Design a protein around this ligand. Sequence first.
Ligand SMILES: *[C@@H]1O[C@H](CO)[C@@H](O[C@@H]2O[C@H](CO)[C@@H](O[C@@H]3O[C@H](CO[C@H]4O[C@H](CO)[C@@H](O)[C@H](O)[C@@H]4O)[C@@H](O)[C@H](O[C@H]4O[C@H](CO)[C@@H](O)[C@H](O)[C@@H]4O)[C@@H]3O)[C@H](O)[C@H]2NC(C)=O)[C@H](O)[C@H]1NC(C)=O
Ligand SMILES: *[C@@H]1O[C@H](CO)[C@@H](O[C@@H]2O[C@H](CO)[C@@H](O[C@@H]3O[C@H](CO)[C@@H](O)[C@H](O)[C@@H]3O)[C@H](O)[C@H]2NC(C)=O)[C@H](O)[C@H]1NC(C)=O
Ligand SMILES: [Cl-]
Ligand SMILES: [Cu+2]
Ligand SMILES: [Cu+2]
Ligand SMILES: [Cu+2]
Ligand SMILES: [Cu+2]
Ligand code: NA
Ligand code: NA
Ligand code: NA
Ligand code: NA
Ligand code: NA
Length: 534
Amino acid sequence: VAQISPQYPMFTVPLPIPPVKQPRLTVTNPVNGQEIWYYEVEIKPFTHQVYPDLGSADLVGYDGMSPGPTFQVPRGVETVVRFINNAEAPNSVHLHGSFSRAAFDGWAEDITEPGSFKDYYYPNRQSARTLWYHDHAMHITAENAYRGQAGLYMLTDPAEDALNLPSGYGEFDIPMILTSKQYTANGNLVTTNGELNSFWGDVIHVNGQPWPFKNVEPRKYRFRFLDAAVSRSFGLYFADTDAIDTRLPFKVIASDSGLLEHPADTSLLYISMAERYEVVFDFSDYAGKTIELRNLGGSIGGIGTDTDYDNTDKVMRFVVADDTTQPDTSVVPANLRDVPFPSPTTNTPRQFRFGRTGPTWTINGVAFADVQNRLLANVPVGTVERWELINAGNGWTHPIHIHLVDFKVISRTSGNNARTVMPYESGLKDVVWLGRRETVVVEAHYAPFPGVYMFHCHNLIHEDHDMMAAFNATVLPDYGYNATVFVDPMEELWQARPYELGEFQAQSGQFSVQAVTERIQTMAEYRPYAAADE
Ligand SMILES: *[C@@H]1O[C@H](CO)[C@@H](O[C@@H]2O[C@H](CO)[C@@H](O[C@@H]3O[C@H](CO[C@H]4O[C@H](CO)[C@@H](O)[C@H](O)[C@@H]4O)[C@@H](O)[C@H](O[C@H]4O[C@H](CO)[C@@H](O)[C@H](O)[C@@H]4O)[C@@H]3O)[C@H](O)[C@H]2NC(C)=O)[C@H](O)[C@H]1NC(C)=O
Ligand SMILES: *[C@@H]1O[C@H](CO)[C@@H](O[C@@H]2O[C@H](CO)[C@@H](O[C@@H]3O[C@H](CO)[C@@H](O)[C@H](O)[C@@H]3O)[C@H](O)[C@H]2NC(C)=O)[C@H](O)[C@H]1NC(C)=O
Ligand SMILES: [Cl-]
Ligand SMILES: [Cu+2]
Ligand SMILES: [Cu+2]
Ligand SMILES: [Cu+2]
Ligand SMILES: [Cu+2]
Ligand code: NA
Ligand code: NA
Ligand code: NA
Ligand code: NA
Ligand code: NA
């Protein structure tokens, strides 16, 4: 249907690459002698000329950019991020794909108001994967993410570097953060505030930039795909501008939780809100050609209900040079890793129905705000459980995200006979798309930390009002590991704290080297992640 947003100079701006986020300093952990990387991120408003000939867009973003700066953290190193709210609305940051403790996981009610900050303590022990950090505050997640609070967080492993995949952030390892938004006639953003069904958007962005291009060499590149849209699911494929309907083959090497066992040969990649898929595409056969990254119409080939606009078929253009400056020395191994699948269970699965109770998106008839009823499962730490995630509807789709765990996709049924499990769903994931009349069974090890965590639809509109619930990963009184201060997300010890803007800008008071050091060392003494020492 007709584009609403003003006309855009398609494919004339280079793909922006988000700068790497650098820690301010390191703090010696008095428990294990090791350095903790400490960072400071300031949430704050800014403007961006999106359309060159019109007014500007009002955004609010981590370090006043969008997308957020990219974190690059090696397994083994613990990090503390101080997220400082200097905006006009509260925040709650969730590091998606990290088994953070409940109070550092971005619980929706665990907000930081403007004029406050919170110290997030992260383990970085899991399999190398593409995480992302984004807002998760109650009722306002959609608008906070839409206005720029999402960013990449790369967890790296020397062991994976030996696979010799295309490499170098910004070089031959390119982030591909997808979003879909709408613009007023003067090039400002059309707000999500008030939308209750779904906010599709008619302008496709990669890394913050509408319909860009990138000059690439005829060799192999690693693409880290993130669907950071509020509501738009994609069906991604590559095509020569000479043969715009003819899909070029590629390899999917990683899902949400890391590498697959083996590259999945693919020419169409379904990707819904909050899914990460890492792709290697070889441009060597297309020297001198232009390859368009494109999006499937017909509501993602009838899997979805998403509205399609004039140019939502288009994502970006790669302009391929005649030669490489240097030889492509990278490979894509047949065998990537041994995926740590959970031990199968024959325990009878729990059922969760993603539907509508009146005007409200619900889980098993319950809305997240209904505190009395929103705790839908107690699961003893260490248990494997199967959860049957059921979309009965033909008029909505739901990418379901379960915090804490990595899970395996066991099965998919479709009431429209559309599909079952995809080859790129062969690995470990933390989000799964319930397409039209789809029911999916997933299997997860509820481990290794006790605490109350969220699960929900990752359609941010549906998520806000109000398709979100909670599980408690429980332990018995004899357990230890300081679990008493770490199962309640609202725990006082970990709550946001006020700051004066002058302290922060001068790096004094609470922000002195000495005070940061006192704070981190104290946090580290509680030993948040001891139970995952092997
Ligand atoms: C998510 O799941 C977690 C478990 O992983 C739940 O947390 C547990 O909740 C129970 C109930 O609150 C806790 O048990 C209670 O402990 C409290 C204090 O215990 C300590 O201090 C007392 C003195 O005050 C000592 O005697 C004791 O040994 C401990 O050192 C008390 O409030 C409770 O005592 C009363 O209830 C029991 C129940 O039978 C009686 O036996 C007692 O005599 C007494 O009448 C109780 O023992 C447990 O400690 C919690 N665990 C952790 C790790 O925090 C979460 O509550 C759950 N969350 C949600 C939202 O459901
Ligand atoms: C659970 O968390 C608590 C609280 O942080 C841990 O107890 C604390 O352990 C640290 C050691 O890491 C103690 O440090 C102490 O410093 C003082 C100097 O003032 C010194 O006198 C002591 O010899 C020691 O080095 C700290 O006192 C202690 N805090 C309390 C309140 O006991 C505890 O280890 C954690 N338990 C687990 C299993 O993780
Ligand atoms: Cl750039
Ligand atoms: Cu998320
Ligand atoms: Cu998450
Ligand atoms: Cu949904
Ligand atoms: Cu979440
Ligand atoms: Na920065
Ligand atoms: Na401000
Ligand atoms: Na070739
Ligand atoms: Na886990
Ligand atoms: Na302490």
